[PDB]
C-alpha cells in the first residue's frame, strides 16, 4: 500500500467504482461496503483518475462531481465523505 | 356434491408453497421468483 509501490507495480488508472445500494445490501454489507470503498480509494495517486457512481433501479453519481476527477488529496476526501452518506434502499438493476 | 373438495384442499397446498419459497428482502427489494409468484396470487385468487 505504500505509494512507491504502487507506483512502480502498475500503471496509471481511469478507475470507476460502482457501488451497488439495493435494498438487500442493507445492514453489514453496506458497512463493509463503505470502508471497503475508502479503503480501494487510498491505494491511488495524482496519476489516476476516479469517480464512485451507484445504483438501484437508477444509477447517480453519488457526489458532486458527474465525471473522472484527479483523484489528489481534496478530491479523494469529497469522495470518501460523499460515500459515508450512502444508504440502502431499491430494487437493483445492473443493467442500468 | 363431485370430488370439488381434493380440487380445493390440493390449490390450498399449492398456496402453501407459493409462501415458503417467498424470499423476504430488506428496504423494498425483489428478484425474479418474487414477482412470479405475485402473479400466481392472483391465479390463487380467483380461484379461491
Ligand atoms: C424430523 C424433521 C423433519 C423434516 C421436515 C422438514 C420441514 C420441511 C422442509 C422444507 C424445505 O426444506 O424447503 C422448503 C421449500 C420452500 O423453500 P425453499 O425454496 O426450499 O427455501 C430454501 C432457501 N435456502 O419447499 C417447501 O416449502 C416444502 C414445504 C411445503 C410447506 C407447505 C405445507 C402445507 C401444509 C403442511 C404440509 C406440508
Redesign the pocket.
Given at each position: 500500500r505504500r505509494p512507491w509501490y504502487i507506483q512502480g507495480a502498475a500503471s496509471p488508472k481511469d478507475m470507476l467504482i460502482l457501488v451497488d445500494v439495493s435494498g438487500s445490501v442493507s445492514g453489514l454489507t453496506l458497512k463493509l461496503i463503505r470502508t471497503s470503498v475508502s479503503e480501494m480509494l487510498e491505494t491511488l495517486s495524482d496519476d489516476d483518475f476516479v469517480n464512485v457512481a451507484s445504483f438501484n433501479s437508477n444509477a447517480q453519481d453519488v457526489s458532486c462531481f458527474q465525471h473522472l476527477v484527479q483523484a489528489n488529496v481534496r478530491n479523494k476526501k469529497v469522495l470518501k465523505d460523499a460515500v459515508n452518506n450512502i444508504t440502502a434502499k431499491g430494487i437493483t438493476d445492473y443493467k442500468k | 356434491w363431485k370430488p370439488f373438495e381434493t380440487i380445493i384442499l390440493l390449490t390450498?397446498?399449492a398456496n402453501?408453497?407459493a409462501?415458503?419459497?417467498y424470499?423476504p428482502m430488506p428496504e423494498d427489494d425483489n428478484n425474479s421468483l418474487n414477482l412470479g409468484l405475485e402473479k400466481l396470487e392472483y391465479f390463487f385468487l380467483t380461484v379461491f
Open positions: - | 390450498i397446498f402453501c408453497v409462501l415458503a419459497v424470499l
